[PDB]
Symmetry: D2
Subunit: 253 residues, 4 copies
């Protein structure tokens, strides 16, 4: 089913979701390339992953870093079959509050970054007769989420980017889809005081926050050939956060 | 790698989409109950599946039936863990041309039908501590498709009914999502003029209609625990059809 | 500035959003034909509305009344230029707690009833050289709302069905759009527990339920020639109910 | 009808949609502050609009410029009651074809430009007790349109920026909606061979391209109190371009 024999570059794979996806894909047969700004950790992720993994330094906003890392894959593995655009920075504040400078920063990573990744990897995949680009968006890209400011703007952008890219590359067998994670447990969200566990996140239909491995599974599905006719699609992995409001809220929560 | 060891019932499982979902389910371990109105074929398909498959006549618009085949799976197999609502019919005419007689018929099978399946298996799956209901909607449920009238109206109804159900059953570990396949090659479509293969369906970004086995892959995945944090979702398997207009169309020509 | 000088039929016209529209639609100078099953109230309403109004009986489920009423509007006013599909019933219970007979009766009125209206009115408006059909869907037809069961199903139904009719009738200059009202104060919802007034409904961005006049104004925008290039569109009037979750919910309501 | 006895600022006011909105707003009784980079044409227009029009130079990507113009608007007309974020630039090329510096250029204006717009203008609106921000998006922000690249990513970003702002500014009585015009008759499109007139646009359900005033009419609606309950909505003025493919395309023609 969801098996591999390909080379997938994972951006933001030094930690959290990115590493998890790497771990899962390597565990599925793919040879991965981790790319992050977090070097020390990254190589540590690679080193633990095994021989199917290499770590590469990559600043998602620098076209040259992309060009170099994409090239490193073709050389070091023979091809580039998958791209998982995960690297990004978040926002937790009201619109008027956010500085235009920071707005611009966040939008650079989250949006313009996946674009540089796309246009850059596209030729390598054309070279390989098709490929899969999985754009990790957010639940903030599926509905208006209070307090996401620049992050909301950029996750909506990634959703349209995937879609229009999907219609342009279909004939080249280049698949492009977006995955949308809801509240996930990570030491970082743990720092927000987010508790993992059934009953611990009542404001999402499933009453709980998700796990990194849960989102990682859907990334692999879209990397595998079991989804050979899926493109310009959006997959929400949020325990129903974006589907509709919690019952309690429909009454008075 | 989406696995199984549970019992799932596949409505509309005689021929086409249903049968292949049944097929793929079995190859992953699931115990399947092909329910259908088409008794001869459906019985043969179960025959071709093996011991992992039971057939059951079921006219989806009959509450009594659903209660019977669910009961049967319960007794026959010890549980109900998956329900793939695929048994529908189709509308191939303009709205002003259609008779309220056919409209009622299409809606009744395509919409009310899945409602009953859902209302019936819910306790079955509460007893099992969770489940997965995959309502097979269509591209007609994701946009306005000319010539689908009742089939389309009912497919939007089915997309929506999947969502409100997901918010109510989240806490019960029951997961409702919708699969929306595009143009599939079927001897009927073949007859209706549909050619299978590359460049054989230019009016979809990917340039071809999908093989029935390409949809089935997506159904099996949402049935699996690989997607445990996935509810109130809508997956489209249509080679870009529903994402946006084809380049040529964007240009006119 | 929205103005009308044409004939328009409003279903569910005896009261609520329906009658409010009739008032405003006459204020804009249209000739309205109210239609309802509540004939006592209905005639009374048309009386208060004056001479630009005519009450006709219409059991939205009986294709005959549609014909009788559509024949009348044309003969009494020479043309049928608008149709506001407002008649409908509600649902407030957990899905698996709704009988299939009720499920069916609600769909019949909310879904098929708008269909019979579209088909019947089409030729009439074609003879008039165009027209405007406004289907009063719901905020329940824009996301998965809990406890709406049948009402949800049909509302998603009414939304998708407007889109195909829009694509089909676009060249006949017959415009079709759907209006989606969120929580609104109507004496019926009063007999629900709903309150009109500031902060009285904290679970929608704006803080309170809307008034009937807020909805009618929109229906009239789309019923007018100001929205001449508008078809296949969905206008939510719900104080952001549908737009995304409330700031409080977003933080741990 | 829609009356606007208030003061609203229009970006990209020198020409096109911006201008046609200015005329209709001033006609609705609004006091207008046109803003743009094209000082030459901008001045002329304001003049031709009357003593209810003022032209302010404003480069949409510069905060000082915004800070300046909104201030001037407060002094001059005593308040800021509306904002139509219309300034922007387009794109006509394949993603893999467009440069990073260009992508940036375009995002900055269409997305970042609207952010600084909203941020700056919010305090003025709280001051007044409410307001209406109309973010002019595009059909490109509602689906995957090929060749829009940076324009498409930014118009999708604008769609979600508006929705999040609306959840956060609900109780402040500041409404935020997105207008999404499709193909429009404009000498720009005209140089492209786009002919105005019925039948002249096959690939849109309505069989033709729209006029600026058709879109200008929706702006005045959202800006007016007539839409006091609309927030976080999206309105497509596009002849059904976004609601499913054209019948011909459905029939594989
Ligand atoms: N719970 C969540 O954290 C959550 C919620 C919703 C959506 N998501 C999406 O899932 C993705 C992964 O979530 P996460 O918690 O693992 O995030 P994370 O922040 O823990 O990890 C993402 C990685 O991106 C890296 N990165 C940042 N800037 C970079 C740059 N410019 N170049 C290269 N790499 C860079 C970071 O250094 C980090 O290690 C996120 O990007 C987010 O958009 C996450
Ligand atoms: N245009 C299309 O055909 C199309 C496109 C996309 C998705 N789909 C989806 O798949 C289904 C149609 O299935 P298909 O295309 O594989 O072929 P199909 O139309 O042959 O349907 C599959 C089965 O449903 C059965 N069925 C009909 N009425 C039934 C009833 N009342 N009770 C039980 N079973 C019944 C049929 O006999 C058949 O065995 C629909 O549910 C639809 O959502 C269809
Ligand atoms: N009020 C809200 O908050 C709200 C929200 C979303 C959607 N809606 C929808 O708006 C429409 C009605 O709004 P309302 O507030 O005026 O409600 P209402 O029910 O108070 O009044 C509308 C009318 O529907 C009529 N009706 C029912 N069956 C009929 C039939 N068979 N033939 C003819 N008329 C029939 C009733 O007689 C009634 O006069 C319905 O579709 C409702 O579902 C209302
Ligand atoms: N063919 C079209 O013109 C067309 C069609 C559909 C949608 N749209 C969209 O609708 C809006 C207006 O369309 P239009 O028909 O008026 O097109 P237009 O390009 O003639 O007008 C856009 C205006 O933005 C101004 N502008 C650019 N950068 C600016 C900045 N930095 N600060 C201030 N002003 C700036 C331009 O100089 C121009 O006057 C745009 O956002 C556009 O994306 C345009």
């Amino acid at each position: 089913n969801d098996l591999s024999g390909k080379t997938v570059i994972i951006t933001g794979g030094a930690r959290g979701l990115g590493a998890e996806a790497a771990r899962q894909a390597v565990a599925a047969g793919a040879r991965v390339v981790l790319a992050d700004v977090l070097d020390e950790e990254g190589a540590a992720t690679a080193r633990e992953l095994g021989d199917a993994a290499r770590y590469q330094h990559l600043d998602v906003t620098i076209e040259e870093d992309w060009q170099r890392v994409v090239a490193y894959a073709r050389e070091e593995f023979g091809s580039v079959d998958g791209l998982v655009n995960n690297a990004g920075i978040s926002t937790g504040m009201f619109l008027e509050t956010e500085s235009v400078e920071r707005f611009r920063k966040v939008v650079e990573i989250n949006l313009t970054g996946v674009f540089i990744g796309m246009k850059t990897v596209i030729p390598a995949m054309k070279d390989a007769g098709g490929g899969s680009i999985v754009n990790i968006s957010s639940a903030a890209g599926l509905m208006g989420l209070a307090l996401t400011s620049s992050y909301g703007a950029s996750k909506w952008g990634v959703r349209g980017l995937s879609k229009l890219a999907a219609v342009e590359l279909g004939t080249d067998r280049i698949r492009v889809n977006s995955v949308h994670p809801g509240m996930t447990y990570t030491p970082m969200t743990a720092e927000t005081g987010i508790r993992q566990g059934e009953g611990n996140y009542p404001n999402t239909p499933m009453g709980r926050v998700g796990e990194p491995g849960e989102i990682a599974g859907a990334v692999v599905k879209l990397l595998s050939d079991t989804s050979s006719y899926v493109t310009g699609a959006e997959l929400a992995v949020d325990g129903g956060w974006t589907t509709g409001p919690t019952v309690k809220y429909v009454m008075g929560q």
